[PDB]
Amino acid sequence: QLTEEQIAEFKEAFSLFDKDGDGTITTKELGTVMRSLGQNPTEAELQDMINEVDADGNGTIDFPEFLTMMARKM
Ligand SMILES: C[As](C)(=O)[O-]
Ligand SMILES: [Zn+2]
Ligand SMILES: [Zn+2]
């Protein structure tokens, strides 16, 4: 299970790139969020993630979908 500390850190790193504070980021900023967490995904691995959290291809990711995908990755 994710810990409270993991959820809080995932939230904080995401929020660094949510400039308008509405709980969404662009798919182009997902790698920057992951690197902010000290991870180093490949472009490949980023594409697979974007495939899970931006199924419709609108180029946005909300925090709930980011968090469950990370739960699955961790
Ligand atoms: C009003 As908007 C598309 O910048 O969240
Ligand atoms: Zn917005
Ligand atoms: Zn959503």
State which amino acid sits at residue 1. Answer: Q
Contacting residues for 27 by C-beta, under 8 A, at least 6 apart:
50, 53, 54, 59, 60, 61
Alpha-carbon distances of 47 from 30, 33, 52, 65, 67, rounded to whole Å: 10, 14, 9, 15, 16
- DSSP secondary structure of the chain: ---HHHHHHHHHHHHHT-TTSSSEEEGGGHHHHHHHTT----HHHHHHHHHHH-TT-SSEEEHHHHHHHHHHH-
Ligand nearest the Cα atom of residue 66? 3
Domain that holds residue 57: 1-74
CA distance 65 to 9: 15
How many domains does the chain divide into? 1
CA distance 62 to 10: 12
Q: Experimental method used, please?
A: X-ray
User: Residue 74 sits in a domain of what CATH number?
Assistant: 1.10.238.10
CA of 17 to the centre of ligand 3 (A): 17
